[PDB]
Design a protein around this ligand. Sequence first.
Ligand SMILES: N[C@@H](Cc1c[nH]c2ccccc12)C(=O)O
Ligand SMILES: N[C@@H](Cc1c[nH]c2ccccc12)C(=O)O
Lengths: 321, 321
Amino acid sequence: METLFSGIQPSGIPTIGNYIGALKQFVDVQNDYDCYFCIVDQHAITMPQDRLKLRKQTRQLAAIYLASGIDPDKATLFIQSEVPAHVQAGWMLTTIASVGELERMTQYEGIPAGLLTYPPLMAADIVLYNTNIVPVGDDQKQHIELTRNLVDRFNSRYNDVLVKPEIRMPKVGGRVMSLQDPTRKMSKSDDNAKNFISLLDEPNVAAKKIKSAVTDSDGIIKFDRDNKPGITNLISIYAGLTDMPIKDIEAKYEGEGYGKFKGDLAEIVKAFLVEFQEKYESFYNSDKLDDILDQGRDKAHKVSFKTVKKMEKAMGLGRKR
Amino acid sequence: METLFSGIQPSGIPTIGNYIGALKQFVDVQNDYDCYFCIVDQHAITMPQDRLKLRKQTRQLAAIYLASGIDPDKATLFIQSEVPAHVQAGWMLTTIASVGELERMTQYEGIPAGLLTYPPLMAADIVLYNTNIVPVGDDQKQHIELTRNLVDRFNSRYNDVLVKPEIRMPKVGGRVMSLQDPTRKMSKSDDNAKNFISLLDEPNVAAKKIKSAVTDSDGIIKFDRDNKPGITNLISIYAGLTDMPIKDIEAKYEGEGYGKFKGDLAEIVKAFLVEFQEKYESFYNSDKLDDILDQGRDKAHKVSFKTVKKMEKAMGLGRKR
Ligand SMILES: N[C@@H](Cc1c[nH]c2ccccc12)C(=O)O
Ligand SMILES: N[C@@H](Cc1c[nH]c2ccccc12)C(=O)O
């Protein structure tokens, strides 16, 4: 089984576009890949963070992942700071990185040093679990290139212990776009909140967002990205939440116009969110969430401890015992 | 009781000058201060290190410290990489440091990034134990200034949990100088090996070093740094190893010349090293050294765990449990 590692920032709610694009996909591929979902609280404090909200946001992301169907027995869901191996391996790889390498990543009151020194810690996050694949976007290509180079450097200078990962998402979800700007990806931090549907949006608010999506006044329900990106995006969301094949959506709405389809889809979005948020609340407000995160932490520790031990031995840190 | 923290680099043997200047002093002040002697193996890999020798050098320094009389019940002697709190707190303080701050420390194949990012890890090493005093030299003033500023910054932004240290050596030992250049401090890395007496020099070699020290051909045994730095340095070494007051050395050698005094002192240096190295061997080659380092590691962990827990809570890392 190939090992997958996804680092999750605890600084904002995934949208329905995030869920159709990755989360729902992870819920499937966790059966066929050894999956690591790391809530990277130590990467989050490289950026401005409010101390009193950060713990909450970390609990929210774990709750969202679990409510999506991320399964704590099949996968390893854990918080980064709770597994010391991350800053242990991250310091080790920082020593073999170069200032220039780190500086070129920042190009692709003072400037907080975490924004400069996080890339070796990201590399450590991945290789600690002998990761084969990382499902990241093109904005992280430099980070994986640095990771592979640090793995080559480490193995060549000390001895082969670390695994080079590849960027790879085993099952790419459909692309969901901004509801009032269908050429851009949907983003949780849009200034126009009608552009995204958050997984924690009020369900009624989210149906209104479907009704407010920018489309032609009417038309056929047909998939056509280039000419009708507005209705097409809506059809992609319909597909993502129902699992209806797109051609099967076209058949169901043959002879129907936008009013019927948008009304139906808004009810689908509403219903998905009512079900998702009830699962989300029951995870977020339960004592067992702390047990689940403890188990995840323990599983990540048992694997990365061996990795960090091999690294320390290879570099001559610590003691032979 | 005030808490003291000394970071020990595992990259070369202390000399008799190091022992008279600090080690013998620590053996006394460990009764009246809560003393932390940290073998900083993670700072050592910021610099070129051979993986196969580094573990040895770390065991050597622990053996040297114990042979000096550093007492593992009175003090805390431990290896830095064995206590995860150091890279945990070190990452936390790196996030609030600035690139400029780190860059200005480096002024006072590529340039290894550890040489840039170690100062917050040094700051972490100290404050983890609520250190009051650090016995360091003027070459570390910038490091302690950064440490105090990071402590102010941390306490002000998150909440008061960390203690500002001062540079202070409770009992300054005598200054020992190069045996063939008595204006410079004695250094373990001199290119002229007759300048230093290593604690692991062959005892016979070390007496010859006393006999080879650069002095006048003859003279009175009198302390006078400005006019007779050569014989004066030798008298300071005689004092350091015998505990004879300098005026009492002058009395014993009234009417004597350099030949008698140097011959005596060489026998004293030889005898000190025979006793020190027998203690050094028995620590270095015993199984109980690993027990002593385990106990030291455990003591350092029990204290710095609380400190790192307060820092994580103050920054909002991890979980409330
Ligand atoms: N750097 C990623 C988060 C992250 C940290 N470590 C990772 C390892 C793999 C993938 C992602 C990550 C981000 O900014 O979102
Ligand atoms: N930087 C010190 C070693 C060190 C690391 N942490 C410390 C804390 C206190 C004193 C010294 C240290 C040196 O170069 O020698």
